[PDB]
């Protein structure tokens, strides 16, 4: 079976862009150094250690108490906010991928941890958070890109993501067989990039030794689509410590869909949002 | 030749909905009382008298100087924010129209004034702010609704909006003649309601004298779609003086697209935005 291509960080962007249209997915090998990965893991550990609140939790309250989830990791994990989120290889890919739709930003970035004994996900498309995506035709400009960060090893046994190459060209998901998929086996620091409409499934975790598989999922969307997570409650001090790119990703700046939108989006008083807010940024100068 | 149906403000919503799927548009007669129309007009006169800006204007700078425009009237006109934005009939229509896509909110509401001697708009659909709308099939859940408030009289002289009935079912805009459209002639306090994909055009203004024609356009979108105007810089006192419904329309609350989105949208910390912000409201 044709496998997912593993590319070094210096790989050609045109090539990556074409990989996404032909195969629908690929892996960037060793993008994040191990020190970044381990700093990110420790920040995430802090969040998972927090005793559960007394109040409502929108997603978590639907699941049993052993559910492992960290929402909107950019507000609590400085390593993601300052290093992972603004990786220039990721954004080179995004800019080439989103060329026909225009600007993109971060819709969500969150931790999942899959424990030993968990079954695999059903095969699906990532068209549920913004259901209108389910009706976009294949040839329309893509509005969503999935970026999957393994924070432990992804192996065959512990549930490496199952991806069916070319499946973004299918009419429906149907009920595909597992052996039609290939495995995104990976080391921490690798990155898996998945095109809109590609049929895939988390592999669960069939190990029995008690070692959980840890994944951070980041969804970059056209700025036409409302971010699932809103970063508007970030303190000004935190917002201003980020770079312009980071501020743009977290919804703090006016953005531009492609023509025929010739004005922009996410603005106020006919001015750019960062101007009305007098937003400073770390790399303004 | 079929005309725009004129309906009483208290008409049945099922009939308003049949019209939007058959004609694609209709007119509500006398929805806003005269005292609402007058105070709204007074609040817009204040903004119209604000001196010309010193910095860039994202929209205004794109067009010649006869472009009279007041963006995001929700933040500067209390009558719109406290009365027109939350009108219960408008929302009965919206809830029915957006049933398949789920929750909706305000993408934009703004004032345009069209002086004498202005030519009509080219025929078009309202699919430019969110270009992905161009590729949605006709059968897919609608994600946008246009609500047009005449603040002066719309007449055949001064450029009442031209609407081509049933044109939401066309594959493309094409090159339609002006005589394929019917005119949304209205008095202030009426409301023109236009379905997504309906071909239409601003009438311009064929008059030679007279004050400009004045219109407030509100675009209501699925909460899946990012609001053109962000109301996030409204002061907390202003936000908490509004009703829950008002806060939802202006992006200050977590919202719910339809299943299979089973969590919602516009949340933070796995919590509702209004709960993180400890947001009071006029009616909660
Ligand atoms: Co003719
Ligand atoms: Fe998925
Ligand atoms: Fe229009």
The CA-atom distances, in angstroms, between A30 and each of A37, A94, A237 are: 10, 18, 32
Distance CA(A5)–CA(A26), nearest Å, equals 5
Which of chain B's residues have a Cβ under 8 Å away from the Cβ of A261? 128-131
All residues of chain B having their beta carbon less than 8 Å from the beta carbon of residue A75 are 268-269
Neighbours of B100 (CB within 10 A): 12
How far is it, in rounded angstroms, from Cα A132 to Cα A119? 29
Is the CB of A268 inside 8 Å of chain B's CB atoms?
yes
Distance from CA of B61 to the nearest CA of A (A): 10
- Diameter of chain A by CA atoms? 58
User: Is A131 an 8 Å CB contact of chain B?
Assistant: yes
| Whether A39 contacts chain B with CB within 8 A | no
Distances (CA, A) of A66 to A57, A217, B255: 14, 19, 27
- For Cα atoms B132, B224, B81, give the angle at the middle one, nearest 5 degrees: 110
Rounded Cα distance, B150 and A232, in Å: 34
Rg (CA), chain A: 19
Q: Are strands A104-114 and A69-70 parallel, antiparallel or unpaired?
A: antiparallel
Q: How many residues does chain B have?
A: 284
Residue A154 has, within 13 A of its CA and on its CB side, a CA count of 28
Compare all CA atoms of chain B with the CA of A260 and give the residue at the minimum distance.
Answer: B128
Listed residue (B110, B202, B116, B188) closest to B150, CA to CA: B188
What residues of chain A, 170 to 209, have a C-beta less than 8 Å from chain B? none
In whole angstroms, give the CA distance from residue B212 to residue B48.
Answer: 12
CA of A126 to the centre of ligand 2 (A): 5
- A282: in domain: no
Strand pairing report for A6-7 and B161-163: unpaired
CA B34/CA B214 separation, integer angstroms: 15
* Rg, C-alpha atoms of chain B: 19
Residue of A nearest to B62 (CA): A263
| A285 in a structural domain | no
Active site residues of B: 63
Provide the 8-state DSSP code for B219. E
DSSP string, chain A: -PPPPEE-TT--HHHHHHHHHHTSEEEETT-S-HHHHHHHHHHHHHHHTSPPPSS--TTGGGS-TT--EE--GGGT-HHIIIIITT-HHHHHHHHHHTTTTB-EEEEEEEEEEEPTTBPPPPPB-S-SSSGGGGGS-TTSPP-EEEEEEESS-B-TTTT--EE-TTGGG-S------GGGSEE--B-TT-EEEEETT--EE---B--SSS--EEEEEEEEEETTBPPSB--TTS-HHHHHHS-HHHHHHTT-S-B-BPTT--S-BSEETTEEHHHHTT---TT--
In a domain, B187, yes or no: yes
How many domains, chain A? 1
- For residues A42 and A47, what is the distance between their CA atoms, to the nearest angstrom? 9
Residue B283: inside a domain: no
Query: Which entry of A63, A69, A97, A135 is annotated as an active-site residue?
Result: A63
The answer to whether residue A137 neighbours chain B at the CB level (below 8 Å) is: yes
Distance (Å, whole) CA A190 – CA B45: 58
∠ CA(A161), CA(A163), CA(A167), 5° rounding?
Answer: 155
- Position of tokens 């990532």? A126
Alpha-carbon distance B21 to B220, whole Å?
17
Supply φ then ψ for residue A142, to 5 degrees: -65, 145
B194/chain A closest Cα distance in angstroms: 20
Secondary structure (3-state) at B138 = coil
Compute the nearest-CA separation of B89 from chain A (Å).
26
Is omega for the bond preceding B260 within 30 degrees of 0, making it cis? yes
Q: Where are the beta strands (DSSP E) in B52-151?
A: 68-70, 104-114, 144-150
Say if residues B43 and B3 touch (Cβ distance below 8 Å): no
Indicate which CATH number applies to the domain containing B249.
2.60.120.620
Range of the domain at A95: 6-277
* Closest ligand to Cα A120: 2
Q: Is residue A1 part of a domain?
A: no
B176 lies in some domain? yes
Which H or E run contains B218?
strand B213-222
The Cβ of residue B93 has, within 10 Å, a number of other Cβ atoms equal to: 22
CB contacts < 8 A, A to B, total 175
Q: Are B104 and B265 in contact (CB under 8 A)?
A: no
Structure's resolution in angstroms: 2.1
Q: Is A63 annotated in the active site?
A: yes
Angle formed at CA A167 by CA A214 and CA B139, multiple of 5 degrees: 110
* Ligand 2 centre distance from Cα of residue A205 (Å): 16
Q: How far is B269 from chain A (nearest CA, A)?
A: 6
Residue B282 belongs to some domain of the structure:
no
Q: Ligand 1: distance of its center to the CA of B191 in Å? A: 28
> Within B76-219, where are the H helices?
78-79, 88-97
Q: Which residue is closest to A225 within chain B, CA to CA?
A: B225
| Ligand 1 ion local residues (Cβ < 5 A) | B 177, 179
- Of the listed ligands, the closest to the CA of B177 is 1
Tokens representing A156 are: 């065959």
In a domain, A249, yes or no: yes
Rounded to 10 deg, the angle between the B88-97 and B13-22 helix axes is 50
User: Does the distance separating the beta carbons of B223 and A226 come in below 8 Å?
Assistant: yes
| Residues of chain A positioned with their CB less than 8 A from the CB of B259 | 131
Structure tokens at B237: 């006192």
Angle between helices A13-22 and A88-97 (to 10 degrees): 60
B272 contacts A233? CB cut-off 8 A: no
Q: In whole angstroms, what is the distance from residue A41 CA to residue B230 CA?
A: 34
Beta bridge partners of A145: A195, A220
Q: What count of Cα atoms within 13 Å lies in the side-chain half-sphere of residue B214?
A: 18
Hey, how many other C-beta atoms are within 10 angstroms of the C-beta on A88? 9
Distance of CA B273 to the CA centre of its chain: 25
């Amino acid at each position: 079976k044709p496998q997912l291509q593993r590319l070094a960080a210096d790989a050609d962007v045109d090539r990556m862009c074409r990989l996404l249209e032909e195969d629908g997915a690929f892996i960037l090998k060793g993008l994040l150094p191990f020190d970044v990965v381990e700093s990110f893991n420790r920040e995430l550990d802090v969040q998972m250690a927090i005793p559960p609140p007394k109040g409502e939790r929108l997603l978590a309250d639907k699941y049993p108490p052993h559910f492992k989830y960290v929402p909107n990791v950019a507000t609590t994990c400085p390593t993601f906010r300052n290093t992972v989120l603004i990786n220039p290889v990721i954004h080179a890919i995004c800019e080439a991928y989103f060329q026909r739709t225009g600007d993109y930003w971060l819709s969500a970035a969150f931790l999942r941890e899959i424990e030993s004994g968990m079954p695999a996900q059903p095969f699906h498309r990532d068209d549920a958070t913004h259901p209108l995506m389910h009706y976009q035709p294949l040839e329309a400009p893509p509005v969503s890109l999935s970026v999957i960060f393994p924070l432990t090893e992804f192996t065959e046994e512990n549930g490496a993501t199952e991806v069916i190459l070319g499946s973004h060209r299918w009419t429906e998901v149907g009920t595909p067989e597992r052996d039609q998929a290939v495995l995104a086996t990976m080391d921490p620091g690798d990155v898996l990039i998945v095109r809109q409409r590609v049929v895939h499934a988390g592999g669960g975790n069939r190990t029995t030794a008690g070692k959980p598989r840890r994944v951070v999922l980041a969804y970059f969307n056209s700025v036409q689509l409302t971010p699932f997570e809103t970063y508007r409650t970030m303190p000004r001090e935190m917002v201003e410590s980020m770079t312009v790119l980071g501020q743009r990703m977290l919804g703090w700046r006016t953005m531009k869909p492609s023509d025929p939108n010739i004005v922009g989006i996410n603005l106020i008083d006919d001015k750019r949002l960062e101007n009305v807010l007098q937003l400073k940024a770390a790399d303004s100068p």
